[PDB]
Design a protein around this motif. Structure first.
Motif, PDB file in Angstrom:
ATOM      1  N   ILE A 175     -89.960 -94.116  15.873  1.00 33.95           N
ATOM      2  CA  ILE A 175     -88.809 -94.364  16.744  1.00 33.95           C
ATOM      3  C   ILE A 175     -87.569 -93.658  16.189  1.00 33.95           C
ATOM      4  O   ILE A 175     -86.736 -93.148  16.947  1.00 33.95           O
ATOM      5  CB  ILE A 175     -88.566 -95.889  16.927  1.00 33.95           C
ATOM      6  CG1 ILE A 175     -89.727 -96.512  17.717  1.00 33.95           C
ATOM      7  CG2 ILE A 175     -87.232 -96.159  17.617  1.00 33.95           C
ATOM      8  CD1 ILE A 175     -89.835 -98.029  17.613  1.00 33.95           C
ATOM      9  N   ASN A 184     -88.618 -98.285  11.820  1.00 33.75           N
ATOM     10  CA  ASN A 184     -89.795 -97.562  12.303  1.00 33.75           C
ATOM     11  C   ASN A 184     -89.506 -96.062  12.359  1.00 33.75           C
ATOM     12  O   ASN A 184     -88.570 -95.633  13.035  1.00 33.75           O
ATOM     13  CB  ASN A 184     -90.237 -98.101  13.674  1.00 33.75           C
ATOM     14  CG  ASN A 184     -91.514 -97.451  14.177  1.00 33.75           C
ATOM     15  OD1 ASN A 184     -91.523 -96.271  14.533  1.00 33.75           O
ATOM     16  ND2 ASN A 184     -92.600 -98.224  14.213  1.00 33.75           N
ATOM     17  N   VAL A 200     -86.584 -95.986  23.700  1.00 39.06           N
ATOM     18  CA  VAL A 200     -87.579 -94.935  23.511  1.00 39.06           C
ATOM     19  C   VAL A 200     -88.648 -94.985  24.608  1.00 39.06           C
ATOM     20  O   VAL A 200     -89.102 -93.945  25.093  1.00 39.06           O
ATOM     21  CB  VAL A 200     -88.189 -95.035  22.081  1.00 39.06           C
ATOM     22  CG1 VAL A 200     -89.605 -94.495  22.011  1.00 39.06           C
ATOM     23  CG2 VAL A 200     -87.281 -94.340  21.075  1.00 39.06           C
ATOM     24  N   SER A 260     -86.621 -99.517  20.368  1.00 35.13           N
ATOM     25  CA  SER A 260     -87.992 -99.440  20.854  1.00 35.13           C
ATOM     26  C   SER A 260     -88.017 -99.400  22.380  1.00 35.13           C
ATOM     27  O   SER A 260     -88.741 -98.603  22.976  1.00 35.13           O
ATOM     28  CB  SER A 260     -88.797-100.632  20.330  1.00 35.13           C
ATOM     29  OG  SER A 260     -90.178-100.477  20.602  1.00 35.13           O
TER      30      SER A 260
END
Ligand code: 3ES
Ligand code: 3ES
Ligand SMILES: *[C@@H]1O[C@H](CO[C@@H]2O[C@@H](C)[C@@H](O)[C@@H](O)[C@@H]2O)[C@@H](O[C@@H]2O[C@H](CO)[C@@H](O[C@@H]3O[C@H](CO)[C@@H](O)[C@H](O)[C@@H]3O)[C@H](O)[C@H]2NC(C)=O)[C@H](O)[C@H]1NC(C)=O
Ligand code: NAG
Ligand code: CL
Ligand code: CL
Ligand code: ZN
Length: 581
Positions: free
Chosen positions: A73, A70, A9, A6
């Protein structure tokens, strides 16, 4: 680690925004001003973006995409793991960027001249000749000359281009560049899916081909057209015989129902490139879709400069990756064709604006075909005799067949052409076609798929694929085949949403907020979800389907069959070896 992914990204998005924005500016500055200086700065930004891509790509490869939870992502990191050309070693990367630059520059500055000293450019000079000339020799001069000047001049670069683009693909885990291009659709059955869609359009194409061949026989003479052979490739109103509506006047089913000169109408009534784009903007807002920002009007290049500047004329739409700056670069001519192109390009801009708040990695279409489709969907309604009359550009089943014919000349004829371009490139990329086979294999596909033949023998050193923009510019083409299939699916669904009943071809989505909101919801998704989800949001089903296209053209199919049967036409080209004497 989910939290580290996360975080990665987020850093990728922040830094990508800056670097891609800077690259886009340098790219734009070169495209709209081909100079020694703008070339030097662009190749420098090539080095900068490659450095950025290698840095974050290398980092992205440390994450196992499958072990991530996720999916947003997950999708971003997977995309960033493909370094594309930035995977190449320093020397190969510099060579590759220069090859691309040289190929695109060579295509965009090529001219065809006569003995005296008169030189013609592709846009608008040669394009106009192909569109309007009804003389065999004049069309031949332009067709052959363009290939002599542009095509031949690309040949020296192409083998090294193929070597380096394949090398990069392999370094990113693909078997060749074609494999990597196909994989962007995220569809295991892609090739079979596309083959089946092509086959479904065969009755429509073969009947159109036979009917047009008969019409060409009528105008150009029995001695120059074989009624059982392929059609000479310079006679279809277009440099690449990819779309045929410019020869409508030769093929009009019911000439008792005439249409006026739309070029003459646009010119006389004061149409300009700016007004053509405003008109497209106005169509979009009529759907409740977004207007282009004031910045678009200040920064775009909507016509060929009279500065003395050399430019890349081929139309394109530009996202500068800051959610504010969007531009079109087009050498617009005042005619109906370029009004359609203007709409197409404004479709790209609409898409850019719709997904502008997504992370940079997801700022593209559900697939590349979706991005090409948007503008064309609206242009289908723009082209209707109803809408064209409302614009004062024009003033019964005979009229229906005439209109369907004009539409088919572009939409049906393009199907085999858009199919073959990458059939050729995938086979070049995989090694099936090599340099000594380039041109011959090109024409084998031109014959097999479109039923065309070259009007003059092709000789040593010819490279006819080089004379088509997307080849030297390394722009994948299958996106356009997908676009032409899916745009009819979108038209069908939007028309249903707009409340249209009866023949699909009579639909005009102008003013439909319901149609607009259906497209908007799908466009806003960008690349965040697999494409069948966006397909389902628009149409109610997840597949690519030729059904809607067939439905649109059904009345023409029936008419063509009857007309062709009356003349005892042979569908296809039995005499496939035939070429002009
Ligand atoms: O479509 C792709 N590549 C895409 C993946 C793909 C490969 C094969 C088959 C299907 C899909 P992807 O990396 O989003 C494609 C993306 C973003 C982008 C910009 C443009 C574009 C179009 C017209 C004018 C100006 C730009 N088109 O896409 C991309 O090319 N990213 C660059 C950054 C970039 C940004 C802006 C720009 O103007 C040019 C490049 C990079 O990663 O280095 O390659 C085609 C191509 C050819 C010449 C110029 C641009 C694009
Ligand atoms: O601007 C482009 N792409 C342009 C090509 C390009 C790509 C990369 C770098 C530089 C340039 P185009 O295909 O809009 C630019 C145009 C479109 C066009 C032509 C026509 C048309 C119709 C009838 C007669 C004559 C022309 N209508 O629309 C293009 O290249 N079209 C293809 C295929 C096509 C043909 C007909 C048609 O109706 C639609 C598409 C071609 O000209 O061969 O891509 C933007 C983009 C950015 C990010 C993600 C997705 C997309
Ligand atoms: C998976 O992760 C995505 C993306 O998450 C975002 O990016 C990460 C790298 C981190 O920086 C996160 O902090 C960040 O949220 C999630 O998608 C996101 O969901 C949120 C909440 O639903 C969306 O926020 C909305 O924003 C709009 C407009 O501002 C409001 O109207 C809404 O009320 C809402 O707050 C956000 O837009 C969205 N972002 C993207 C890119 O899709 C996703 O929810 C998550 N999935 C799961 C299952 O957890
Ligand atoms: C084109 O680029 C040159 C640099 O080579 C620059 O001097 C000039 O200002 C540019 N022209 C325009 C019209 O921007
Ligand atoms: Cl050709
Ligand atoms: Cl593509
Ligand atoms: Zn396009």
């Amino acid at each position: 680690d989910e939290a580290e992914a996360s975080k990665f990204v987020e850093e990728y998005d922040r830094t990508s925004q800056v670097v891609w924005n800077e690259y886009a500016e340098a790219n734009w500055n070169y495209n709209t001003n081909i100079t020694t200086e703008t070339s030097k700065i662009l190749l420098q930004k090539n080095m900068q973006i490659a450095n950025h891509t290698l840095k974050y790509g290398t980092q992205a490869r440390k994450f196992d995409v499958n072990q991530l939870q996720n999916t947003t992502i997950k999708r971003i990191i997977k995309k960033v793991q493909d370094l594309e050309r930035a995977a190449l070693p320093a020397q190969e990367l510099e060579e590759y960027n220069k090859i691309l630059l040289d190929m695109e520059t060579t295509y965009s500055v090529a001219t065809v001249c006569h003995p005296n000293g008169s030189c013609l450019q592709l846009e608008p000079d040669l394009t106009n000749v192909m569109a309007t000339s009804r003389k065999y020799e004049d069309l031949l001069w332009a067709w052959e000359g363009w290939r002599d000047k542009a095509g031949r001049a690309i040949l020296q670069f192409y083998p090294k281009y193929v070597e380096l683009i394949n090398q990069a693909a392999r370094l990113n885990g693909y078997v060749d560049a074609g494999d990597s291009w196909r994989s962007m659709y995220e569809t295991p059955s892609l090739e079979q899916d596309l083959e089946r869609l092509f086959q479904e359009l065969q009755p429509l194409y073969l009947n159109l081909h036979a009917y047009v061949r008969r019409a060409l026989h009528r105008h150009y003479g029995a001695q120059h057209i074989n009624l059982e052979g392929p059609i000479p490739a310079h006679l279809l109103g277009n440099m690449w015989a990819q779309t045929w509506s410019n020869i409508y006047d030769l093929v009009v089913p019911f000439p008792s129902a005439p249409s006026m000169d739309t070029t003459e109408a646009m010119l006389k009534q004061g149409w300009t490139p700016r007004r053509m784009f405003k008109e497209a903007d106005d169509f979009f807002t009529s759907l409740g879709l977004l207007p282009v920002p004031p910045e678009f009007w200040n920064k775009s290049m909507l016509e060929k400069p009279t500065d003395g500047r050399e430019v890349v004329c081929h139309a394109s739409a530009w996202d500068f990756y800051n959610g504010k700056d969007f531009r079109i670069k087009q050498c617009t001519t005042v005619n109906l064709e370029d009004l359609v192109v203007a709409h197409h390009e404004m479709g790209h801009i609409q898409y850019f604006m719709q997904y502008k708040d997504l992370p940079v990695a997801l700022r593209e279409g559900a697939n590349p075909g979706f991005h090409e489709a948007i503008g064309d969907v609206l242009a289908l309604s723009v082209s209707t005799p109803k809408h064209l009359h409302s614009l004062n550009l024009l003033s019964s089943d005979e009229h229906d067949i005439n209109f369907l014919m004009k539409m088919a000349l572009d939409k049906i004829a393009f199907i085999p052409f858009s199919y073959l371009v990458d059939q050729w490139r995938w086979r070049v990329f995989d090694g099936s076609i090599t340099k000594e086979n380039y041109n011959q294999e090109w024409w084998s596909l031109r014959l097999k798929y479109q039923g065309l033949c070259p009007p003059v023998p092709r000789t040593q050193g010819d490279f006819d694929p080089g004379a088509k923009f997307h080849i030297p510019s390394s722009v994948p083409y299958i996106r356009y085949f997908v676009s032409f299939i899916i745009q009819f699916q979108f038209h069908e669904a939007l028309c249903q949403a707009a409340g249209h009943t009866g023949p699909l071809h009579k639909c005009d989505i102008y003013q439909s907020k319901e149609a607009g909101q259906r497209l908007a919801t799908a466009m806003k998704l960008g690349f965040s979800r697999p494409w069948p989800e966006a397909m389902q949001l628009i149409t109610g089903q997840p597949n690519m389907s030729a059904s809607a296209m067939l439905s649109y053209f059904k009345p023409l199919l029936d008419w063509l069959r009857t007309e062709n049967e009356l003349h005892g036409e042979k569908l296809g080209w039995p005499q496939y070896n035939w070429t002009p004497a």
